[PDB]
Design goal:
This is part of a larger assembly, with two copies of chain A (445 residues) and three copies of chain B (127 residues). With 445 residues, chain A is mostly beta strands. Helix content of chain A is 11%, strand content 38%. In chain A, strand 21 and strand 22 form a beta hairpin. Chain B has 127 residues and is mainly alpha-helical. The chains are: A mainly beta (445), B mainly alpha (127). Chains in contact: A-B, A-C, A-D, A-E, B-C, B-D, B-E, C-D, C-E, D-E. The complex binds a molecule of 5 linked components (NAG-NAG-BMA-MAN-MAN) (2 copies), a molecule of 3 linked components (NAG-NAG-BMA) (2 copies), a molecule of 2 linked components (NAG-NAG) (11 copies) and 2-acetamido-2-deoxy-beta-D-glucopyranose (9 copies). It is classed as viral protein/immune system.
Chain lengths: 445, 127, 127, 127, 445
């Protein structure tokens, strides 16, 4: 006959929700992400490729992306907690033009000094974007953009916003499955699965409409979406060639410190050395539109013989209509109307520097989560900063047309960075190992 | 030899060899800051401890604690699976076998517990 | 059949049947907020783990881990209880028996540990 | 008799008698304030639980859970120690012996695990 | 043949780092150290002396002293967290002379009352040390010493600064080794080792240049240092006779309470009953210089036939140059020039009250950790406060001379409070018990 037996440590797993702990190369300025606070990374992550295994993946229904979003916002609030707040800076500022070149404003306002009975008069430079007047008729009196919503918190200068790679390790009894399929679109069954205890280097860089310093594709351009035909769903694309970009801040600001209270200081720009220079970015037009041609021919496989046309941003909020990123502590906002301005036909071929100049905007008062409050005031970085990033993917949003036309327009898609984390966690899924296996055999012999 | 969770695609007759690598990996800056990462680390450690103890108490009450494979007095029922004696040990892996008996795990656990308790009651406590 | 803790009023000879329901219940929103209920939940889970491990380490060092009932080499002493062999197994419950031997639990534990250690020392370690 | 950790200076042949006092001490105001002492207390308790479970899972997978001393199928290798059979059990203490085999603990653990798993695979699972 | 065996609960240990939990006597006023929150102490600590055991100790490389320092500063910040802060007291004070006797200043300043639209005028006495003028030419206008660095926090009167002893217990699986060697210098191999789960009564009293209420030596004067020849290393000495000291506060202050805001009060000195009397301390000159002679002859064994000369500390920070302590809530700063002023030769012999008058200074605004901020304002204790201490050890600092001379000068050592805990944790070391022992035998018989 047959008797039931129990197997301990059996190799089975089920999809479940669980917490995750950090892992990084802890060693020194601390980093907003508190990478030194978590567990130090292993010298070499043990990665094993499972043979004869086919597993179903779903990058849109994954729980790691939501957990990662909650952990990043929690670490952000944690980092801003011991720092000084901007509660006394809501005074009516007096700004005029600086000595296009009208973006900066030379402000002047009153401020309470360390003495509770005395005050101090200071001056600082603020951008027009983070400046809002009381009324549209007076003129020369302005306020902060986030004053009637919440009080911003000045970031501590002892920490840096460098995107330090963090490894999202799984707890004991749990594992992370990796899909090594060539050109996997992120949804369906994977024919080449691998397992690992901790994920690879995940840089929590913040980007909009473009993916900076992301993971490059394996062999071809991959388009990821749960429903490509659905117009309300976002579209994530990946590139095989890292499109370089050079973003600099030509303005040479002078960091100054003023004491707004006992034991607290406020940092702002004093003056500018030289002259006014508009911040911009550079990109090779040949490689950029060559990759655009590859993306168009890849999209041609899903929309048939229709021609792919790219348009600029629709309009509205500056955070979703412009490509933003944190460059060495300074938040950038570049206009992408020169990168999504072209059309591609079926017989079209892209066929020297010829760089493209992309105008950019700088904002110190940012929210970075689309929340109704809890803003952050980015401190000014002294000197001239320069940033170089590897463009590996972008976000797309198709216009809600009738679809019967020969052409459809695409716009630079936006989001709350959840899709950005999805673009890096698509290859990973969280499972729960059940070491209790049940199987019968002819025992009792 | 394969590493951790490296024999999942193999058949049940061959995947029961490297069980020690999965059994060993069930549990594997001194000051804790109790921050965002600290609280998650503590929760992960407590959850891992609870998971190991929860799956270990079953083996403890079944009379097979500290043993990777053991045989009990509960006979197999054909209602759970109508397959033969060795068609699963030579052609099916553990991934396609756990879903077939997933609806009868609780019943098997209760029968196993009552049979083991009855066996210990009849063996021990002579008078 | 009775549920959890349903045979307390029964005699000791019959209450030792459903011990598996009490042994199984010794350990039985994913993100923790660590609030008033979160801290108490974590403390309760840690206390339950500590209680189970504290009462399990005794069985582990007594040579009876994973066994609900076992017999040792320590003989019973009439000073702890002058009752007969079966008057407690047929007429007294476990509630009126724990208080009679409550003053000698530590002594019995120490004698049990030394006897078990001596037995393991004489059995194992041939040379 | 000596107390907790009282036979460390004695030889290995005589220090293996009071092992129960070290085995028992491996785990030993109700509301927690979660202050400086509260957080450290919780961390110490969790670390103690993790240490005990980490050193207990080895005995669990080696087929010797709940036993203070047991013998396995892995033979001793002269490369680890060239000493005789009883020169360490009659003249050397445990403090001077742990450092000589400290570089081969992982190798012995892996060989022990594979030998125990192979023995359980050959004994159990008849067909 | 031989077979490998596993021993459970084997008696071995290794040096490791681990957390520790408190153990105080459960008993009422809570103590700044929150000793009522930790585990109650055992009725009798089980201490066992290991026979045939010789263990190496290192008091300077120990981790318990660092962990203890972090725990004490953490408890200090914890105790100051629910209390009221001194943020509105940074107003320009107006102080004059009181009605030497010019140490105290009768200040008068404006302060906001419980009503948000009204203020109140109060007066209080402050020491000259915690008073800093705005400029050195105006005169009669002053500020607090810690106003441009951070805002101090008033200590809660519901707790006391009594140095109640605490037992640093080790977690399960860990133990603390004790060295019972007679006259052990704190570095090297100990020939008489003992083990215990929890340390003895450790009073976390904070003192500089002198060890108050410490552990007395066993048989002879012991000098502890990792390198006695190194001039940059601190020197810790222990005494066999408890040198008594009587420190009083003859000023009879009147505690007054003013409400600086809704639901918060500020305590300060109202007036003085009687007359101005300088605070001082008393010590028997015979016993003090007799112990100095013993310390000199003990130091003679390390520096050869050279003569030992004691001089006062070099000018600088008041927390280091003077001896500090506390008498139930009042901080003192006594001048040590009256004690470290003598010379001792090889043939010298010390050979009635004759007490020594040591002038002392009292400061309310203290940092007690040499931090750039996070100060504490000690509330004034009403009535006359007097505390008696047992001088058991001192800290020394040798001058960086050429060493070829016949005499070398010694200065009163001090600095960080790490040495205070190091002078009490030298006898203890933290180890980790590994119950997994490996040893072969002729089994399978
Ligand atoms: C995608 O990834 C790339 C490659 O990592 C990133 O490019 C880096 O950007 C960071 C800023 O985000 C740059 O770091 C900054 O460089 C300046 C000086 O660095 C020089 O010296 C160091 C010496 O260690 C070299 O490693 C480095 O290569 C340079 O030669 C300074 O502006 C910054 O110094 C900061 O710290 C010091 C110390 O406190 C302060 O005094 C400064 O004021 C300042 O705070 C900083 O180190 C880095 O150089 C860039 N690398 C390259 C290769 O160009 C991209 O930013 C990233 N993309 C995105 C969107 O995040
Ligand atoms: C080294 O160790 C010695 C010995 O322990 C310490 O000396 C003690 O110092 C403390 C203060 O730090 C003294 O305690 C204070 O005594 C005063 C009243 O005490 C009387 O009543 C008690 C009742 O039992 C008697 O034991 C005692 O002899 C006296 O008759 C008051 O100043 C204090 O009371 C405080 O608390 C109450 C309650 O809130 C308040 O009402 C008071 O206003 C006040 O705040 C306090 O009790 C103690 O008497 C000293 N002992 C001896 C033997 O002299 C040293 O201080 C210590 N050295 C260092 C540097 O810390
Ligand atoms: C915004 O407006 C402020 C206020 O007018 C400007 O700050 C001041 O700028 C002037 C002109 O550069 C500086 O004056 C110079 O200072 C010294 C000492 O007097 C000397 O080099 C010259 O004689 C000259 O006067 C001045 O230092 C500076 N600050 C203050 C506190 O007076 C600021 O430059 C304006 N910013 C921009 C971007 O236009
Ligand atoms: C610091 O200065 C203040 C303000 O001058 C002093 O407080 C005042 O002290 C005087 C005595 O020196 C008090 O006068 C007496 O008060 C009562 C009621 O009038 C009565 O006993 C006498 O008739 C006499 O007038 C005065 O009231 C008091 N002011 C307040 C508001 O209490 C303080 O004494 C000075 N401190 C020191 C240490 O000198
Ligand atoms: C699964 O995909 C991985 C790559 O993602 C393959 O690994 C490659 O194997 C070839 C042939 O041995 C090597 O030359 C490459 O260096 C490997 N690449 C990497 C990135 O490691 C793997 O072979 C695939 N597995 C199967 C079964 O097809
Ligand atoms: C990603 O690839 C999967 C298959 O690996 C696609 O899923 C199929 O989609 C078609 C659409 O017509 C359905 O008919 C099939 O039933 C789907 N197969 C499975 C197994 O679900 C998915 O559409 C792809 N997505 C993109 C954006 O290319
Ligand atoms: C994916 O989106 C497509 C359209 O983009 C859905 O197909 C039809 O959608 C229209 C509305 O656009 C509905 O009226 C039809 O009922 C849908 N047809 C079917 C057969 O569902 C489609 O449902 C979406 N989902 C999937 C899984 O393909
Ligand atoms: C966006 O594309 C349009 C064409 O679709 C560009 O407009 C042409 O610009 C050139 C100079 O670059 C002019 O000589 C042509 O007359 C323009 N054509 C039309 C129809 O207006 C436009 O410059 C592109 N913009 C960017 C930023 O690349
Ligand atoms: C930004 O301005 C600062 C201030 O003028 C520059 O720093 C000076 O650079 C010169 C270069 O010759 C050095 O000689 C000086 O010692 C620097 N310091 C000062 C205080 O003058 C800085 O170089 C400027 N940055 C750029 C990129 O031009
Ligand atoms: C280790 O030192 C301790 C003291 O630190 C010694 O204990 C003393 O022993 C004598 C002789 O039996 C007793 O009279 C004393 O009362 C003990 N003192 C204490 C403080 O308990 C102990 O004997 C020493 N051990 C060795 C082996 O020399
Ligand atoms: C404490 O005593 C130890 C010995 O027990 C001393 O260590 C010696 O230090 C000297 C320094 O020149 C070395 O040459 C010796 O080799 C050390 N001896 C041993 C056995 O390690 C230590 O210096 C003493 N410290 C004090 C301040 O007296
Ligand atoms: C202890 O300090 C002494 C001096 O106080 C060190 O001995 C010499 O120190 C001088 C500088 O004062 C160096 O130039 C020599 O190289 C040192 N000599 C040696 C042999 O090291 C000594 O090194 C220090 N350390 C110990 C462990 O004794
Ligand atoms: C400090 O001053 C207070 C206030 O005068 C004194 O307290 C009084 O002491 C006398 C002594 O005869 C008592 O009769 C009073 O009842 C006490 N209270 C008041 C409100 O007057 C206190 O004694 C003084 N302390 C010292 C040490 O002289
Ligand atoms: C410090 O020691 C010196 C001597 O080294 C003392 O100075 C002497 O003081 C006495 C009175 O105490 C005078 O009669 C002598 O004339 C002084 N001698 C010299 C050479 O100046 C000094 O008093 C001591 N100070 C303390 C506080 O004890
Ligand atoms: C300083 O230490 C001495 C002992 O070295 C303490 O004197 C003892 O005090 C207690 C108090 O209960 C008395 O019972 C003892 O009889 C005293 N012993 C001796 C030998 O006199 C003294 O109390 C300590 N001083 C302080 C301020 O704590
Ligand atoms: C599983 O993969 C292994 C490794 O290549 C191979 O030997 C075996 O035949 C495969 N089994 C099946 C059923 O495909
Ligand atoms: C970009 O595309 C245009 C239009 O197809 C093509 O003529 C050109 O070669 C491409 N590259 C550059 C650098 O303009
Ligand atoms: C972006 O650039 C285009 C270039 O034609 C310009 O027309 C447009 O106004 C810019 N958008 C913003 C928001 O400045
Ligand atoms: C097998 O399972 C069926 C369905 O639950 C049940 O009716 C039957 O009694 C079981 N047979 C045995 C022998 O346990
Ligand atoms: C029984 O217990 C008594 C009382 O403690 C004790 O004196 C006696 O020795 C014990 N007898 C045996 C056989 O252990
Ligand atoms: C003993 O150890 C040595 C050194 O690691 C190794 O080469 C040898 O194979 C081992 N012998 C046995 C019998 O395991
Ligand atoms: C202190 O030392 C001096 C100088 O050696 C000596 O004469 C005296 O007796 C000692 N004692 C006192 C109380 O002065
Ligand atoms: C300490 O006493 C000495 C004795 O010479 C004296 O010169 C000094 O001014 C006193 N005060 C301080 C604060 O050092
Ligand atoms: C010790 O003798 C020396 C050499 O004569 C002398 O200078 C010194 O004063 C003497 N010390 C005394 C008497 O304390």
């Amino acid at each position: 006959n047959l008797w039931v037996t129990v197997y301990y440590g059996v190799p089975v797993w089920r999809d479940a929700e669980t917490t995750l702990f950090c892992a990084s190369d802890a060693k020194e300025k601390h980093n907003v992400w508190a990478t030194h606070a978590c567990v130090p990374t292993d010298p070499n992550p043990q990665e094993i490729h499972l043979d004869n295994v086919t597993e179903k993946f779903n990058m849109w229904k994954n729980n790691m992306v939501e957990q990662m979003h909650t952990d990043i916002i929690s670490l952000w609030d944690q980092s801003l907690k011991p720092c000084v707040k901007l509660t006394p800076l809501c005074v009516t500022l007096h700004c005029t033009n600086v000595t296009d070149r009208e973006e900066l404003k030379n402000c002047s306002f009153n401020m309470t000094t360390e003495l509770r009975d005395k005050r101090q008069k200071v001056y600082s430079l603020f951008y027009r974007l983070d400046i809002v007047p009381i009324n549209e008729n007076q003129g020369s009196e302005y306020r902060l953009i986030n004053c009637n919503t919440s009080a911003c918190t000045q970031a501590c200068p002892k920490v840096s916003f460098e995107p330090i790679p963090i490894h999202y390790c799984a707890p004991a009894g749990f594992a992370i499955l990796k899909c090594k399929d060539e050109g996997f679109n992120g949804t369906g069954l994977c024919k080449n699965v691998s397992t690992v205890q901790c994920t690879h280097g995940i840089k929590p860089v913040v980007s909009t409409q473009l993916l900076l310093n992301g993971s490059l594709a394996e062999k071809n351009i991959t388009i990821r979406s749960e429903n490509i035909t659905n117009n309300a769903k976002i579209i994530i694309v990946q590139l095989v060639q890292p499109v370089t970009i050079k973003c600099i801040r030509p303005n040479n600001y002078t960091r100054k410190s003023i004491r707004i209270g006992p034991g607290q200081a406020f940092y702002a720009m004093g003056d500018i050395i030289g002259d006014i220079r508009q911040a911009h970015c550079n990109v090779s037009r040949s490689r950029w539109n060559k990759t655009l041609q590859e993306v168009a021919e890849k999209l041609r496989t899903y929309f048939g013989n229709k021609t792919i046309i790219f348009a600029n941003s629709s309009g509205g909020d500056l955070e979703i209509t412009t490509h933003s990123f944190n460059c060495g502590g300074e938040f950038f906002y570049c206009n992408t109307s020169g990168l999504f301005n072209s059309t591609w036909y079926v017989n079209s071929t892209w066929n020297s520097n010829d760089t493209i100049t992309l105008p950019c905007r700088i904002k110190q008062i940012i929210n970075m989560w689309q929340r109704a409050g809890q803003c952050m005031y980015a401190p000014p970085i002294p000197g001239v900063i320069k940033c170089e990033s590897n463009i590996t993917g972008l976000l797309l949003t198709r216009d809600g047309g009738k679809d019967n036309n020969v052409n459809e327009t695409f716009r630079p898609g936006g989001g709350d960075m959840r899709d950005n984390w999805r673009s890096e966690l698509y290859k990973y899924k969280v499972v729960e190992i059940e070491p209790l296996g049940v199987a019968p055999t002819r025992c009792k012999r | 030899r394969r590493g951790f969770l490296g024999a999942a695609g193999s058949t049940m007759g061959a995947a029961s060899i490297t069980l020690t690598v999965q059994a060993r990996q069930l549990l594997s800056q001194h000051l804790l800051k109790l921050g965002v990462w600290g609280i998650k680390q503590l929760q992960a450690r407590v959850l891992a401890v609870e998971r190991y103890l929860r799956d270990q108490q079953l083996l403890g009450i079944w009379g097979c604690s500290g043993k990777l494979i053991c045989c009990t007095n509960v006979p197999w029922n054909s209602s759970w699976s109508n397959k033969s004696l060795d068609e699963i040990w030579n052609n099916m892996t553990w991934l396609q076998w756990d879903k077939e008996i997933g609806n009868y795990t609780q019943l098997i656990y209760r029968l196993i517990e009552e049979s083991q308790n009855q066996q210990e009651k009849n063996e021990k406590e002579l008078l």
